[PDB]
Amino acid sequence: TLLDPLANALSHITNSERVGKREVYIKPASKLIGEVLRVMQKYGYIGEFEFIDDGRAGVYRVQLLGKINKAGAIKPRFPVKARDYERWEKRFLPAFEFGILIVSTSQGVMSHKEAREKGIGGRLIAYVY
Amino acid sequence: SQEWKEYAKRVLDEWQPKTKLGMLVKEGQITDIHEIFRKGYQIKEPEIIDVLLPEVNARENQEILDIALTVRMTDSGRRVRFRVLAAVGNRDGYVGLGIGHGREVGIAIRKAINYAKLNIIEIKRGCGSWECRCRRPHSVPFTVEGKEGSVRVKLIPGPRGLGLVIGDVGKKILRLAGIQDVWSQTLGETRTTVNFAKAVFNALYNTNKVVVTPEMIERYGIVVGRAMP
Amino acid sequence: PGKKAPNGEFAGRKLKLKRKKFRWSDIRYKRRVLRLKEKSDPLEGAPQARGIVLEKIAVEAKQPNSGMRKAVRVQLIKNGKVVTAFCPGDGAIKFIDEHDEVIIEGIGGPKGGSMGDIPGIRYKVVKVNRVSLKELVKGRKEKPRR
Amino acid sequence: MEIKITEVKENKLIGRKEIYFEIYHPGEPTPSRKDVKGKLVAMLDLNPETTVIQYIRSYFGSYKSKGYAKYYYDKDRMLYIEPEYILIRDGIIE
Amino acid sequence: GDPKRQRKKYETPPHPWIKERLDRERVLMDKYELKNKKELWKHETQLKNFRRRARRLLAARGKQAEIEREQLLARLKRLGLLPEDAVLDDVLSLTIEDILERRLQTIVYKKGLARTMRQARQLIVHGHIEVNGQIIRSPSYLVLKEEEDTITYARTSPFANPQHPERMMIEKAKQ
RNA sequence: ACGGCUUUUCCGGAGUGUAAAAAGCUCCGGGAAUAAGGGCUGGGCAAGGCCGGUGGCAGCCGCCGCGGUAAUACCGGCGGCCCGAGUGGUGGCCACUAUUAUUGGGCCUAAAGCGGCCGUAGCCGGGCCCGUAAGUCCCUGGCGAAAUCCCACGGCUCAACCGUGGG
Ligand SMILES: [Mg+2]
Ligand SMILES: [Mg+2]
Ligand SMILES: [Mg+2]
Ligand SMILES: [Mg+2]
Ligand SMILES: [Mg+2]
Ligand SMILES: [Mg+2]
Ligand SMILES: [Mg+2]
Ligand SMILES: [Mg+2]
Ligand SMILES: [Zn+2]
């Protein structure tokens, strides 16, 4: 049954855009989904999006640009110390400043490049590149 | 660089082409190797490369990976024929790899070296490791993977000075292309050099299938083809 | 086939139990924790032994070979068991007399066992009366006790 | 041999002075004890029978040796706190 | 547990019979006239350690990584192997033939004190050379930079007299 | 094969060193004089298409594999290759092995899906809002002996070893 409406979202995006689609409808829509999309757009990976309500959890219209290689979800959601990012970067991304590693810090959701500035940690949730 | 530059001036006369790219080349229109590739042509005349990459035949830009004789039975014994695998490339930015078949060893080598010029590709180089952060074209720009047969390879960037740490018949291919430092992680059966060679070739090809921003370029140093020879 | 069984965050115990239970289906780890080499082993965890010869024999080589390989029957000291040893070198069987104190090594085959065509021999003589058989076979030294 | 003295350090409790010097002698053996004692007792004009030479030793291929000597005000004090073997090696007592 | 055992300061090759490796090390042994291979791997390790040290201080950050960073350029250029304005990245482009140019043998030969490298070895090991006023009898000493100019003959050596029938053959080559 | 040179090492001799000795170190007299073995030589794997023995016998062989009267593979001689005051043999652990797999393995036909279904503990669990602060994150006090590990500098001829500082 439905256990993770975030993994479904990122895998559906990566299946769609790999074949050529220009729009997707993320069916169940948390505020955590939208909070990922907010920072997955700022770096230049998707177009623009809005929330279409239908009396049951709403949906998400997101239109692609054909500019991502692979997205997914770090599932066990390990915690990371503030000085120990590179160790996890050498497992997911393919170069020294490639992609982003979305972290759920104590002050919102933000890419690790903005966590190492303020020096904080938090559970990992997903990764895009 | 002269003897391998009068060679083209000698070849460019006694060659009356039959395809169309031949006409384009022999009429001075197309004049540089970097402009027959990303446009959807077909290449069937092996003299086109002798004129734009005249060094591909220098005997130190050539290589004979394996030779093996195979057999088929018949009611009058066994009929035995060879198979050679050969690669060619200037040690800058271009490689090719082909096979060829025959019933003796010079003829198989000849056809192999031929079909290794009609299977040529250009790659992307850079420096994407975590240790070295210079901007020089000695290594792969970012990890890539290519598969073949039953053999998966994965090529990881490595810091300047560390050599080539890969199998035996990977070193020849990665030395003919210009790469000088790399790491590696493989699977499957890596004793059949045909499949191992084709997986390394496919990984080097897949190098140019990853999307990059106009700013990631001046952070790894990605050069395409030659880079100030 | 599914994904993989206990990939949870608070699922440590089941994971450790799964791995510990499927480690026993191995055969090198089982043979080590139980200490099964010993108590089935006439040399008892040693790299040599010393025995007293009883007789001299010869064996037949394997299927696609032809010959007879010379050998001896040694009776150990620390146990009293009987092992079959093999004399290496061209003309060694001409020195081993009865009632000799010989030394005994392995033979170095796969899995510590036997090797080559000699199928059931797994020990080889090195010293006879404290004079290296290697020398005796090629001159270079004299033999004690007659 | 030519001697340079590097440290004369007094001592009011034991009642003595420590003399740290060094010999420079390229092409000659290590000096004797009689000879170093003579040069010292002529240089600083001490008593020639209360001064002891604790050690002189030569380093690896340096043609320069390091010494260290002790000199006493009272005689019997020396003969009381100083060990036995050093007086014999330096010949004072027998 | 166990106490400290002393450990070897070099590393062998992984496979002892790679062809294009023997034919590459054969050249360096004949050119500098080393005694045995164990004398050469010592320097290869002496270099690999530098590379492995400057390879960790470059993906690092903090207070004390900074302090150690500039203590690697310090020695690495006080020893002569780098120029006076080199950045950290140059430690990665060093080559074995740059260490082997710093043994005492090569320096006593690259200054006219000897006729040929296999003669400077005997000159040293019999005790005639003199590095900064101190006889040294080890031809593999890595000479520093602050003293490269102060190498002469011993003050009490037969060579230190410009009439020795051997010491005059020496400059018969410098022409 | 002729000419010269040196004395680290080697014999005697003098200082010094040491609780007394001995080693060691500085100076003298002689002398190139006193000082290279061990394993491999068919492929994996660097190195011979040479000579004489042996005739499915003797032997070799970690695995594949040689020997049947024309042996590059066994026994010698002559050549050559790798290490070198060392070099080979037999046992044990790690890597090799993604043949124990959290990173990171498999399950139609190759080893492996319970004959089928219900269900207890346990692991996994939809959307929104308001509190708490156990988990998790950052700052700061008290602890986790010395020796051991990495780095710079200094002392024994450099170095092994020892000291003063930073981790
Ligand atoms: Mg032979
Ligand atoms: Mg060979
Ligand atoms: Mg398997
Ligand atoms: Mg929920
Ligand atoms: Mg401690
Ligand atoms: Mg000193
Ligand atoms: Mg030091
Ligand atoms: Mg210490
Ligand atoms: Zn680089």
Domains of chain D in sequence order: 1-94 (3.30.70.330)
Q: Do residues A84 and A128 both lie within one domain?
A: yes
- Distance separating alpha carbons of residues A117 and A111, to the nearest angstrom: 11
Q: Where are the alpha helices (DSSP H) in chain B?
A: 3-11, 21-26, 47-52, 105-115, 168-176, 193-206, 217-220
Q: CA angle E18-E21-E24, nearest 5°?
A: 155
Interchain contact, A95 vs B133, CB within 8 Å: no
Which positions of chain F lie under 7 Å from any protein Cβ?
4-8, 13-20, 24-28, 45-47, 56-63, 65-68, 74-76, 81-85, 89-93, 98-103, 105, 107-108, 113, 122-129, 135-139, 148-153, 156-158, 160-161, 166-167
Strand D64-72 to strand D52-58: parallel, antiparallel, or no bridges (unpaired)? antiparallel
- Distance separating alpha carbons of residues D77 and D85, to the nearest angstrom: 16
B79 Cβ contact partners less than 8 Å away, ≥ 6 residues apart: B71, B72, B73
Q: Strand, coil or helix: what is D52?
A: strand
| Nearest residue to F46 via alpha carbon and C1' | E17
- Distance separating alpha carbons of residues E131 and E128, to the nearest angstrom: 10
- Of A68, A92, A112, the residue that ends a domain is A68
Q: Do residues A26 and A74 both lie within one domain?
A: no
User: Cβ atoms within 10 A of the Cβ of D68, count?
Assistant: 17
Q: Kindly state whether residue E8 falls inside one of the protein's structural domains.
A: no
**Inter-axis angle of helices A7-17 and A31-42, nearest 10:** 40
Q: Strand, coil or helix: what is B160?
A: strand
Beta strands in chain E (DSSP E): 129-131, 151-153
User: Tokens 């060659």 map to which residue?
Assistant: B15
Partner chains of E (3+ C-beta pairs under 8 Å): B, D
Is chain E touching chain C, with at least 3 CB–CB pairs below 8 Å?
no
User: Cβ atoms within 10 A of the Cβ of B156, count?
Assistant: 21
Q: Do residues A74 and A104 both lie within one domain?
A: yes
- Distance separating alpha carbons of residues C76 and C53, to the nearest angstrom: 9
E24 Cβ contact partners less than 8 Å away, ≥ 6 residues apart: none
Query: How far is CA A69 from its chain centroid?
Result: 13
Q: How many domains does chain E have?
A: 1
Domain that holds residue E24: 16-175
Q: Where are the alpha helices (DSSP H) in D4-61?
A: 33-43
Q: Hey, CA dihedral for A11, A96, A44, A40, is it positive or negative? A: positive
**Closest chain A residue to C10, measured at CA:** A76
Paired with B122 in beta bridges are B94
In what order do the strands lie in the sheet containing A23-26? Answer: A23-26, A59-64, A46-52
Lookup: tokens for B168: 């035996």
The reported resolution of this PDB entry, expressed in Å, is 3.3
Do the Cβ atoms of D6 and E135 come closer than 8 Å? no
Q: What is the number of CB-based contacts under 8 A between chain D and chain E?
A: 14
Q: Determine contact: B165 vs chain E, CB below 8 A.
A: no
Dihedral angle over CA of C5, C11, C14, C17, nearest 10: 110
Number of H helices, E strands in chain D: 3, 4
Residues of E in contact with B161 (CB under 8 A): 51, 92-94
User: Tokens 């037949």 map to which residue?
Assistant: C60
Q: Hey, CA dihedral for A113, A115, A118, A121, is it positive or negative? A: negative
Give the DSSP H/E element, type plus range, for residue B70.
strand B62-74
Domain that holds residue A49: 1-68
- Distance separating alpha carbons of residues A78 and B105, to the nearest angstrom: 59
Q: CA angle E89-E91-E93, nearest 5°?
A: 90
Strand B151-156 to strand B144-148: parallel, antiparallel, or no bridges (unpaired)? antiparallel
For residue D7, how many C-alpha atoms fall within 13 Å in the half-sphere facing its CB?
10
Residue A52, burial from CB neighbour count under 10 angstroms (0-12, 13-18, 19+): exposed
Give the DSSP H/E element, type plus range, for residue E13.
none
- Distance separating alpha carbons of residues B141 and B139, to the nearest angstrom: 6
Lookup: tokens for A1: 């049954």
CA of B182 to the centre of ligand 2 (A): 29
Q: Do residues A56 and A117 both lie within one domain?
A: no
Q: How many domains does chain A have?
A: 2
Q: Kindly state whether residue E24 falls inside one of the protein's structural domains.
A: yes
Is chain D touching chain C, with at least 3 CB–CB pairs below 8 Å?
no
Residues of B in contact with A18 (CB under 8 A): none
Q: Kindly state whether residue E6 falls inside one of the protein's structural domains.
A: no
Do the Cβ atoms of C50 and C102 come closer than 8 Å? yes
Long-range contacts at A67-71 (CB < 8 A, ≥ 24 apart): A67/B211, A68/A13, A68/A14, A68/A17, A68/A128, A68/A129, A68/B211, A69/A129, A69/B210, A69/B211, A70/A14, A70/A128, A70/A129, A71/A10, A71/A11, A71/A13, A71/A14, A71/A40, A71/A126, A71/A127, A71/A128, A71/A129
Q: Do residues A57 and A76 both lie within one domain?
A: no
Q: Do residues A63 and A80 both lie within one domain?
A: no
- Residue B85's nearest CA partner among B57, B62, B58 is B62
Do the Cβ atoms of B157 and B183 come closer than 8 Å? yes
Interchain contact, B219 vs A97, CB within 8 Å: yes
Do the Cβ atoms of E159 and E151 come closer than 8 Å? no
- Distance separating alpha carbons of residues B24 and B27, to the nearest angstrom: 5
E29 CB inside 7 Å of strand F: no
**Mutation target among A75, A78, A123 for the C interface, most CBs of C within 10 A:** A75
